Amino acid sequence: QSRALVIAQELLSSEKAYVEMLQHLNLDFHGAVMRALDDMDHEDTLAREELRQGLSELPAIHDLHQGILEELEERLSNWESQQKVADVFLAREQGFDHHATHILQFDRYLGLLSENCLHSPRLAAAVREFEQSTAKHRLLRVVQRLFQYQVLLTDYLNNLCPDSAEYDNTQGALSLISKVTDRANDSMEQGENLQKLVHIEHSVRGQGDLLQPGREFLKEGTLMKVTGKNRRPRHLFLMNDVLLYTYPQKDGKYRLKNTLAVSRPVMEKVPYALKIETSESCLMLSASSCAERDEWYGCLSRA
């Protein structure tokens, strides 16, 4: 009840920040690119028309979320009378279709954008002015909200009564969004990774925002920290970028213990041993098998 109240508050606060972001995207990215492309009409046409189609989704998304925010703001003001938010998503099936449409042409118009900047001073001038505050990276932030609703709405459902019209609606809103995010995973080269990083951020108590350009999730798994003769569990999130060193809690959630920037010793009391070394950090970890130890070795090696 308090737990579900704080999650709707978490949903509203993050929605405000998202609507503010979609606002400045439409003014500084869509607006500036529309202005440029309108000039280029009088300067090829194909690239512009495809850019215009993919860019048309941004105002439609902005309007969708402007509405979600207005309904969310009002519903949280009258929380001690009606304690319902899920149905706000259900009411907007047509709205989230713009998300699906955006996802479907995402890589096409964004690839077409950087490509067309290499020989279009006007388009380059528009994109630079925006990149001021990489565009394709700055637009993953649009599609990322969808994975956030999934994580938030799942935390919202776990605190609802399994026999509520709201538990039902939350499930419906979850399947409605999953219909949309399915397209991200199968139509975007960065969709599967964007999802991994959204779920990994939300699970780790200590890791804020993993969305970094070029960052890609590689391996997860628990290993034992060898402190003398004592063996304590540590859950590892290995990226090409950074190495998250955590502790698995009873919650299914974790705790960021240290972070590392991406040897196999022989010792009796520590069989299946892994020694990860950097100039700032060193970990003495034990695997359960010499195959588990060599699975991680080859993966930590590859990057």
- Give a count of the beta strands, DSSP E runs of length 2 or more: 7
Q: Sketch the major β-sheet.
A: 7 strands, mixed
Residues in β-strands, percent: 15-25%
Radius of gyration (Å): 23 Å
Domain DH: 3-187
Subcellular location: Cytoplasm, Cytoskeleton; Cell projection, Ruffle membrane; Endoplasmic reticulum; Golgi apparatus
Domain PH: 216-303
Protein name: FYVE, RhoGEF and PH domain-containing protein 5
Can you walk me through this structure?
This protein is α+β, with helices and mostly antiparallel strands and 303 residues long. It has two domains: 1-206, Dbl Homology Domain, Chain A, CATH 1.20.900; 207-303, Pleckstrin-homology domain (PH domain)/Phosphotyrosine-binding domain (PTB) (PH-domain like), CATH 2.30.29. It has a seven-stranded mixed sheet. The chain is 59% helix and 16% strand. It contains ten helices and seven strands. The longest helix has 39 residues, at 2-40. It starts with a helix and ends with a helix. It is flat, with a radius of gyration of 23 Å. This is FYVE, RhoGEF and PH domain-containing protein 5. Its main location: cytoplasm. Residues 3-187 form the DH domain. Residues 216-303 form the PH domain. It comes from Homo sapiens.
